[PDB]
């Protein structure tokens, strides 16, 4: 990484990045393309989001990341992470949007890292011709775009499609960094978010820094309270066998 203030929030955490971040770093930090990072949950893709944010804060310090997480508790957790990381140590304003349109325009105008849920960014981006602060964002990170195939998932798709459509119209591209779980059809999420074939880092579920040993126990009990009570002793036996 380049700037000393940027390393001063990663010094004592870890000396070396995980191999996903090593492979993804030169495209996220040292390039300006839309980046898809498809890595399993636990690979540290939020540090790839932070690479994009450090690039956006290198290009000009009054830049504006917008960070979309599909679950509101994930938004709270990354707000607690990045308020300690980017506001305490880089003095860049990290705001987290709440469901009020009157104060979200103020938080978007005043903040450099705009945490959100899709429905909180949907009500801002629906009037993106009016709101200039929706237009000139410099980076749009979408954590966990693999939640596009679930409930409250069409709204995530509509706000990323709108954030690509805005970027097709506003004299300056909104650099999308889509983080996700490891996808099979990641060429479609790359083609939908403008990622290259070289900037689409779709990894495998076996690529994780700590290898997952996944055992699956079938319980052929069709009644579900009976299955749920028949699982109670194998829970303890799985605890004694595995950890």
């Amino acid at each position: 990484l380049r700037n000393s203030a940027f390393e001063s929030l990663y010094q004592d955490k870890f000396p070396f990045f995980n191999p996903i971040q090593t492979q993804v770093f030169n495209t996220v930090y040292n390039s300006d393309d839309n980046v898809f990072v498809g890595a399993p949950t636990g690979s540290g893709k939020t540090i790839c989001a932070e690479f994009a944010i450090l690039r956006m804060l290198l290009q000009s310090s009054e830049g504006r990341c917008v960070y979309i997480t599909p679950m509101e508790a994930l938004a709270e957790q990354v707000y607690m992470d990045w308020y300690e990381k980017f506001q305490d140590r880089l003095n860049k304003k990290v705001v987290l949007l709440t469901g009020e349109t009157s104060t979200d325009l103020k938080l978007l105008g005043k903040g450099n890292i705009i945490i959100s849920t899709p429905e909180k960014w949907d009500i801002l981006s629906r009037r993106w011709k009016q709101r200039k602060n929706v237009q000139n964002i410099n980076l749009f990170v979408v954590d966990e775009v693999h939640l596009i195939g679930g409930e409250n998932g069409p709204v995530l798709e509509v706000i990323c499609s709108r954030m690509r459509y805005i970027s097709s119209q506003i004299e300056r591209p909104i650099r999308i960094v889509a983080l996700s779980s490891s996808l099979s059809n990641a060429k479609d999420v790359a083609h939908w978010l403008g990622c290259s074939a070289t900037s689409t880092f779709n990894f495998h579920p076996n690529v994780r820094p700590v290898p997952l040993e996944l055992h699956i126990q079938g319980f052929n009990i069709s009644h579900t309270q009976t299955r749920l009570l028949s699982m109670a002793k194998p829970v303890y036996h799985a605890i004694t066998k595995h950890s």
């Binding site: 779980s181 999420v189 579920p205 040993e213 996944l214 126990q217 799985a238």
Partner: protein, 425 residues
């Protein structure tokens, strides 16, 4: 390590989708009408050709060509893709025009109507306002309005779990309005009972107040949508009923109870003792002395900390209103009434929300109407923080003077129903 205990019917479904990477498919074609309405009120979608052109920007277009049979397609050719997208858009825009949310002229060019502007302003499902403008008449009231708002499609994802039915039946015998045909498999009558139990500030089970906080997050935009649909429909009394419902759902009190249950740590002993003396409002109580504030009923030293900052933080706004050309107005001419809203105290913090989950900023409705004819003349929402300005024009018909009434109604607090009656022409 991860040990997934699952039914053996679901075992190979997990042996697929957890070791090999994830196939994601967009489900936008079922949840389409909201965003189509929203891009129509933005004038992004101005015709059906731009509806297909907007739909090409989605993940749905990119996944219809790689996995066609997920989306009821029969091929990836330009004919199949173009006609499936055209059927998708002409089905959703038929659903929006049949909802009267948009208007389709020449069968090609779409435009936003009133209901679509209301549905995309405060982020409401199109079928909820399809239900609102079809289900609010000129004589609805807060007794039925909670049935209207509880029937919103923003509440169909409330959870019905097992053992949820009979304690809701226990809730169906208590709350201040009864339910005609209550089926406790319904999400909607559950949100009706939970709205009433929040308004009656009843004790709840923890798993039910866990869903009541889910309800009240989306309640206030639904009530503002009711305010705006009755604003466009020109009905004074249901609009003021909705403005009353907005403030009481934030202060967790009923309308047929008096206006001091709003204050923290005040139970029915205070209602019974203040009715038997001659005092009913908080303006009937805040005009006392500190000892007289304490010589009315019980007291403790945290009560004096919270009730005093409650009286600090409620809106102390009085009026100023202004009419140009009072005698010199005739039939046909548009006329103004200008309102300055003299707030006499500092705003330090949001509304007091002790039972409401969100940090809400207070709003206002400078609304004018007909005290006899029940005709909603005009209304504007307002956020001020100090004495600000609001102008509002309208048109008066012929044969002379019309006696209008100006109301000032909030979405968060009692005791400020300032109405001032006057006449023009």
């Amino acid at each position: 390590r991860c040990v997934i205990m699952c039914q053996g019917s679901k075992k190979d479904f997990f042996k697929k989708f957890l070791y090999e990477p994830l196939p994601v498919e967009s489900h936008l074609d079922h949840c389409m009408h909201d965003h189509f309405n929203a891009e129509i009120v933005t004038k992004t979608i101005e015709n059906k050709q731009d509806a297909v052109d907007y739909l090409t920007w989605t993940f749905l277009y990119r996944r219809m060509t790689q996995n066609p049979n997920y989306y009821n397609l029969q091929g990836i050719s330009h004919r199949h893709l173009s006609d499936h997208l055209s059927e998708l858009v002409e089905q959703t825009l038929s659903d929006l025009e049949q909802s009267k949310c948009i208007s389709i002229e020449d069968e090609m060019d779409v435009a936003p109507l009133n209901l679509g502007m209301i549905a995309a302003y405060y982020y409401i499902n199109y079928t909820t306002i399809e239900l609102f403008s079809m289900s609010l008449n000129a004589k609805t009231k807060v007794r039925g309005l909670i049935e209207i708002i509880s029937n919103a499609a923003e509440y169909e994802n409330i959870p019905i779990r097992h053992h949820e039915d009979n304690l809701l039946r226990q809730l169906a015998q208590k709350v201040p309005h009864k339910l005609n045909n209550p089926k406790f498999n319904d999400p909607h009558v559950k949100t009706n009972l939970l709205l009433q139990a929040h308004l009656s500030r009843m004790q709840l089970s923890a798993e039910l107040q866990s869903d009541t906080e889910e309800i009240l997050s989306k309640a206030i935009r639904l009530i503002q949508a009711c305010v705006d649909v009755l604003s466009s429909n020109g009905w004074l009394s249901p609009a003021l009923a909705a403005m009353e419902l907005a403030q009481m759902v934030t202060q967790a009190m009923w309308s047929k109870d008096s206006y001091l249950k709003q204050l923290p740590h005040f139970t029915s002993e205070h209602i019974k003792r203040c009715t038997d003396k001659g005092v009913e409002s908080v303006f009937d109580i805040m005009e006392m002395e500190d000892e007289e504030r304490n010589a009315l009923l019980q007291l403790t030293d945290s009560q004096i900390a919270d009730v005093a900052r409650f009286c600090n933080r409620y809106p102390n706004i009085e009026l100023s209103y202004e009419v140009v050309d009072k005698d010199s107005i005739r039939s046909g001419g548009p006329v103004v009434v200008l309102v300055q809203l003299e707030r006499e105290e500092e705003v330090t913090g949001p509304v007091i929300a002790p039972l409401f989950p969100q940090k809400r900023e207070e709003g206002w409705w400078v609304v004018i109407g007909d005290a006899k004819s029940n005709s909603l003349i005009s209304i504007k929402r307002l956020t001020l923080q100090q004495k600000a300005k609001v102008k509002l024009d309208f048109v008066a018909p012929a044969t002379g003077a019309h006696n209008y009434t100006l109301y000032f109604m909030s979405d968060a607090y009692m005791g400020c129903d300032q109405e001032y009656k006057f006449s023009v022409d």
